[PDB]
Amino acid sequence: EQVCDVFDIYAICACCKVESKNEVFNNYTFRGLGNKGVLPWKCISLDMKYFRAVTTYVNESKYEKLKYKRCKYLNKETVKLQNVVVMGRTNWESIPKKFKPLSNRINVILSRTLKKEDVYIINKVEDLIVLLGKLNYYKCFILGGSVVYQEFLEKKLIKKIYFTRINSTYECDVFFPEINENEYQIISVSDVYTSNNTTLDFIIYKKTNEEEDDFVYFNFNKNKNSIHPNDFQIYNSLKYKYHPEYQYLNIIYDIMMNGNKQSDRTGVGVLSKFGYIMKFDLSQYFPLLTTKKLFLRGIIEELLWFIRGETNGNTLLNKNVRIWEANGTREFLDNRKLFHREVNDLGPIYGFQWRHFGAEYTNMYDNYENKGVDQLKNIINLIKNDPTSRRILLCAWNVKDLDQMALPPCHILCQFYVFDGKLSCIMYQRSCDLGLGVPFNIASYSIFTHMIAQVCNLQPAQFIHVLGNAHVYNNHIDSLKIQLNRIPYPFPTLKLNPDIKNIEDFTISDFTIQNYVHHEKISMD
Amino acid sequence: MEQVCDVFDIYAICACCKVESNEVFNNYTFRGLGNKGVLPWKCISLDMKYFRAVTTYVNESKYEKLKYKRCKYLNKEKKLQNVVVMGRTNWESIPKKFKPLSNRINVILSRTLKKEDFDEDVYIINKVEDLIVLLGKLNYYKCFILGGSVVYQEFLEKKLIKKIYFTRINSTYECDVFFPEINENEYQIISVSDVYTSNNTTLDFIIYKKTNDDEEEDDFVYFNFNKEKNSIHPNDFQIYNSLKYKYHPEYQYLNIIYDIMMNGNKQSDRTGVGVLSKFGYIMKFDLSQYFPLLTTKKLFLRGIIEELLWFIRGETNGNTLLNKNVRIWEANGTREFLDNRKLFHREVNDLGPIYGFQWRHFGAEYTNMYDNYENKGVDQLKNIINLIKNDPTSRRILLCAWNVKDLDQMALPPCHILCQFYVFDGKLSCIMYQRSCDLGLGVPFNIASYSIFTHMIAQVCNLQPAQFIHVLGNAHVYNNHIDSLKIQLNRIPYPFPTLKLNPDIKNIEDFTISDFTIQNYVHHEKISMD
Numbered sequence A: 001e002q003v004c005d006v007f008d009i010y011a012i013c014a015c016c017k018v019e020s021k022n023e024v025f026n027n028y029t030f031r032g033l034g035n036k037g038v039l040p041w042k043c044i045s046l047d048m049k050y051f052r053a054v055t056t057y058v059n060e061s062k063y064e065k066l067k068y069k070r071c072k073y074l075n076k077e078t079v080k081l082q083n084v085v086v087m088g089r090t091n092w093e094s095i096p097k098k099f100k101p102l103s104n105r106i107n108v109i110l111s112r113t114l115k116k117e118d119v120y121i122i123n124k125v126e127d128l129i130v131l132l133g134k135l136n137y138y139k140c141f142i143l144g145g146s147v148v149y150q151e152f153l154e155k156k157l158i159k160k161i162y163f164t165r166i167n168s169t170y171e172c173d174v175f176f177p178e179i180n181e182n183e184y185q186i187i188s189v190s191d192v193y194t195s196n197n198t199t200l201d202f203i204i205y206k207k208t209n210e211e212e213d214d215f216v217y218f219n220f221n222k223n224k225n226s227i228h229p230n231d232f233q234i235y236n237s238l239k240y241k242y243h244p245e246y247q248y249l250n251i252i253y254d255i256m257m258n259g260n261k262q263s264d265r266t267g268v269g270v271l272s273k274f275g276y277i278m279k280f281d282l283s284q285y286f287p288l289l290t291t292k293k294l295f296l297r298g299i300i301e302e303l304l305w306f307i308r309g310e311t312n313g314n315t316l317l318n319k320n321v322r323i324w325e326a327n328g329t330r331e332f333l334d335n336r337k338l339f340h341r342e343v344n345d346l347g348p349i350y351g352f353q354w355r356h357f358g359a360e361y362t363n364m365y366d367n368y369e370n371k372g373v374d375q376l377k378n379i380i381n382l383i384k385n386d387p388t389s390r391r392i393l394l395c396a397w398n399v400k401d402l403d404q405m406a407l408p409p410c411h412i413l414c415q416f417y418v419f420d421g422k423l424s425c426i427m428y429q430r431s432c433d434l435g436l437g438v439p440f441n442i443a444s445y446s447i448f449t450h451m452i453a454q455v456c457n458l459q460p461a462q463f464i465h466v467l468g469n470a471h472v473y474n475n476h477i478d479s480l481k482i483q484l485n486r487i488p489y490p491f492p493t494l495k496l497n498p499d500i501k502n503i504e505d506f507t508i509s510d511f512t513i514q515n516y517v518h519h520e521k522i523s524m525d
Numbered sequence B: 001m002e003q004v005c006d007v008f009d010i011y012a013i014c015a016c017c018k019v020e021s022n023e024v025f026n027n028y029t030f031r032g033l034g035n036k037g038v039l040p041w042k043c044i045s046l047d048m049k050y051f052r053a054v055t056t057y058v059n060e061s062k063y064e065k066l067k068y069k070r071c072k073y074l075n076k077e078k079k080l081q082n083v084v085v086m087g088r089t090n091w092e093s094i095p096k097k098f099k100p101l102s103n104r105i106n107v108i109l110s111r112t113l114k115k116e117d118f119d120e121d122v123y124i125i126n127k128v129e130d131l132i133v134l135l136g137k138l139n140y141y142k143c144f145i146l147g148g149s150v151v152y153q154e155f156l157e158k159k160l161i162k163k164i165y166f167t168r169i170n171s172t173y174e175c176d177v178f179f180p181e182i183n184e185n186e187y188q189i190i191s192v193s194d195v196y197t198s199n200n201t202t203l204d205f206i207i208y209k210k211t212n213d214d215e216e217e218d219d220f221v222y223f224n225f226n227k228e229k230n231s232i233h234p235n236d237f238q239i240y241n242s243l244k245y246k247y248h249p250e251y252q253y254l255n256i257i258y259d260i261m262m263n264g265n266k267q268s269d270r271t272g273v274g275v276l277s278k279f280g281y282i283m284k285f286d287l288s289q290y291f292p293l294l295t296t297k298k299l300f301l302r303g304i305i306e307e308l309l310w311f312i313r314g315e316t317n318g319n320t321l322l323n324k325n326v327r328i329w330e331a332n333g334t335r336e337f338l339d340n341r342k343l344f345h346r347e348v349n350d351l352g353p354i355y356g357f358q359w360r361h362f363g364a365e366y367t368n369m370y371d372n373y374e375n376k377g378v379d380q381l382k383n384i385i386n387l388i389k390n391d392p393t394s395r396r397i398l399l400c401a402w403n404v405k406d407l408d409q410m411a412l413p414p415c416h417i418l419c420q421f422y423v424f425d426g427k428l429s430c431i432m433y434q435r436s437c438d439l440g441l442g443v444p445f446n447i448a449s450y451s452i453f454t455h456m457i458a459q460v461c462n463l464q465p466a467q468f469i470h471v472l473g474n475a476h477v478y479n480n481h482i483d484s485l486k487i488q489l490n491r492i493p494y495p496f497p498t499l500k501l502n503p504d505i506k507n508i509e510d511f512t513i514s515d516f517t518i519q520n521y522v523h524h525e526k527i528s529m530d
Ligand SMILES: NC(=O)C1=CN([C@@H]2O[C@H](COP(=O)(O)OP(=O)(O)OC[C@H]3O[C@@H](n4cnc5c(N)ncnc54)[C@H](OP(=O)(O)O)[C@@H]3O)[C@@H](O)[C@H]2O)C=CC1
Pocket: A012, A013, A014, A015, A032, A033, A034, A035, A036, A037, A038, A039, A040, A087, A088, A089, A090, A091, A092, A094, A110, A111, A112, A113, A114, A122, A123, A124, A125, A143, A144, A145, A146, A147, A148, A151, A174
């Protein structure tokens, strides 16, 4: 039996990224504890709420078990419930005097120079175990600061680390100890949030080493595809996985465990399932996958191209955007029976349908001004003017034009929904390459949602991704296995040049991704 | 004090069907126990498998507390097995190869027979109280009363049953003995299961209840640090919220009514009624195990079938359905409605290029509801039927009603935007995306509509229907529907019915109304949403 287990000693810290000088990222990217005696940031209220809630929660119906445990360990039969909060000397000097001692906690100050003549002064870290051994308390929290964190980690006196990850960069003079991946492992991860203009997320480090019957009866009638889940050891060792990235990752997991084995065109073979939904809060984060690197320049130039209504593949290629290069080749168009189609003339695809649905497509150079239905203009007008309409849809799936398209759209339709100055978007995708396409598709429609929201004097809220035929290609399985056993970072944010007030005026400079913390790039094959 | 059935954990388990007699259905509908000494049905596997799993399942860990419980009650200090108790007739209805029931302590209630007339490892008792005695003298996990009708009768009468695990068999058979009429004041339902199909009958399993790492639970509390309505008091959902396990597929529907009521957004709309709305749901239905015709209100299927048939023919003529006395599209076709749609040159009940037209003639210039459109536009339905037969792994099997160019010419723009099909292992599944969803009125029918259509497509392509998947876009509840939905959300579903299609129909155009049969629909009372 261990001191940190008997006496229930945990740390709790909030670390931010630190100023420096291709950047590399690890857990130790978040290590900024303070600057000039004070916190590195000016105020992040959501972490304070977390901290204040965590260090004051107790469950009295569980103390009799802890009290009993602590007594037997010390060879005793004896010792309103409160936690204990242990702080360093400077850390105690840090707090204003109106917030000292901390409300409803047993304040304990570690110091060699104090003792005014209740708040307890302990001269050595060993006096804590002695002081806890004669106290009535639920759990004991090490509030730091920098030195106190170091010694308590050294002496293995830490059971769990409650680690706020503040996803922004500050000037600091003090830093958290480099957590030792042997000593501790991340067991849980929280939702991502935005507070005071920064994203943050909350993780837990763990020290390493009747209706019950009724439920069983209902399961009476309840791996499959040569996947050994011990390859997902880290993925299956997390108790709580609240991070929104797990929506994507769990879908990868489910297809791999349960997918139906199917041939397809390329001859690779997929595992597929049918019908999924993901939701992302665009007002808290920008869902750019952090468990591998993703680039957005080509994604944005594809969307700007869409907005112009161009079908000319050469515009993308002269910008070195090659998303569509393979769909415009002589061979690809000839395989689509498009023998009278100029190379890279992709025909009536997304941009055309969004701005001229119904118009007779002739070639990518033709002048289509005012031919067809300006779907994009229509939905923007409806958002500004008839916001509760249920008819605000952007449809790319023109049944008459499919065969003339270099290929039919994967992204069938966007539906929009407006409430309380908030705009939500649904995109229905008929075919989803979970390994290669879906990460990009999530970012495209999120950016597009922000773009639509800003030109309609609204705030972005939810991006909803509906997957139809959803498939992992077999040659991706090994790469996704590596990716399932990485743990997400807090998401980045997207910034739009505020001065763009109409959907056609966005340019590549008007887009800025802030604080993108990611794992290493993974070539999916 | 304490009650006997809790210390000694006495349960009843039974299986009941419908018996021979605009009918009324209550719980007493399912009451048929046996006929001519035997069970009324031939062999319903999944119920026996369920029966076996419940009566043989023990959990060793819980027995320490169990022995304490019965010790303190009596004022006292081979694997664990359950007790099963049967009446004499019940015991003689069992094939000898299966007697006594494996891994179980068999207790037989009898007056005319003695331990001498039995070869088998079995206890005989002549009166009920002696089971209580015997229970005190044995080591067992739980005690299950198997029947028959007399054994069920007197155990229910003497308040000796703590939980009734009750199989509702949703077919009719000839019977001569019956489970007692359960007393609602004495017992109430607490858990409904999934619906299953087994040996050509749908069934589920329901439970009655008698009426009157340890610090990582803290990690759960910490992560719920940043959480916390409309004018809905949850005491109006006493039955709904009291239910322990709600695994009946219909709770996928009912749970969305609840989510939109408790959480939705108050918005206006065209009608002036205003609604509560949410954005983006998905329901899945296993058409291989049941046909999801809602059971918490009565629904009719004749109109909607006629509609789907009208669709497949390509029709846009509102008179065709009105002469079948089907009024689904009548209001969207009045002179007044069409005028307010600024379709001044459209004849009354000519609905324009709507679903039927877009499915057979997408892109064709619409003229009037009487034109011959043959081989004009793109015949979507045929194209998907040939995709399913010949290119079953295509990810392009899509049916689309949302023809952006024709929207203004439609009486209404379509609510059901698209159907996507998926084929694996000879099983057809269907996604339909609905942009606007009226949970009180439309959605119950729209689930029925596209379930049937999946069946029809699956059949004409020689596949078995599997999964119908409903993606809801703008999902709303009208305020003038809330009070009826409150009643409905506190009704407990019945096992789903089934759909039979005539097997001789090999192409999608040949179906007629009489090729569709909906069987064993058990349902609550009709509900006017207004
Ligand atoms: N972001 C976060 O989660 C946290 C941020 N902070 C920030 O971190 C900084 C404070 O940490 P820091 O500045 O490193 O000062 P500390 O809070 O670490 O306290 C350091 C002092 O603790 C005493 N001490 C250390 N070890 C012992 C020991 N073994 N026995 C007795 N006394 C001991 C010494 O004072 P003596 O002279 O008495 O020996 C030492 O000077 C501030 O900038 C603050 O804002 C504070 C807490 C956590």
